Design a protein around this nucleic acid. Structure first.
Length: 108
DNA sequence: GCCATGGCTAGTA
DNA sequence: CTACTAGCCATGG
């Protein structure tokens, strides 16, 4: 599987995530037949341009939290976009953004 | 080739 | 619950 093939599948997958729903790097990776490529699912998200209609904001980590990144703006934007989607997000002490994963999780 | 990065994760304290 | 580590793997200097 070429990297370009992967990136495209990941993107196709993410677009399938329903409004106001959420999925996981690892889940998407598995979903596209690449269980060990969870980190690369991150990369795919990061690579996207700001205009993209791909719901990159609907992908968090396995702990149901929003991942911290080099570009802190995204971390913030993801929280905001999700909240607009009507997604209850509380803030852990030692400010990490968290949510009830079992509820919002997307299951095809 | 080595090395550091980086939106990860399960297992292990 | 928080912290950390081992396994993980593309990317690019």
């Amino acid at each position: 599987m070429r990297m370009d093939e992967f990136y495209t599948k990941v993107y196709d997958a993410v677009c399938e995530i329903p409004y106001g729903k959420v999925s996981t790097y690892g889940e998407i990776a598995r979903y596209v037949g690449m269980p060990s490529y969870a980190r690369q699912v991150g990369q795919a998200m990061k690579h996207l341009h700001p205009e993209t209609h791909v719901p990159w904001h609907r992908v968090i980590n396995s702990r149901g939290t929003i991942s911290k990144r080099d570009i802190s703006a995204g971390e913030q934007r993801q929280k905001d976009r999700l909240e607009e989607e009507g997604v209850e997000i509380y803030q852990t002490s030692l400010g990490e953004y968290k949510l009830n994963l079992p509820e919002y999780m997307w299951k095809p």
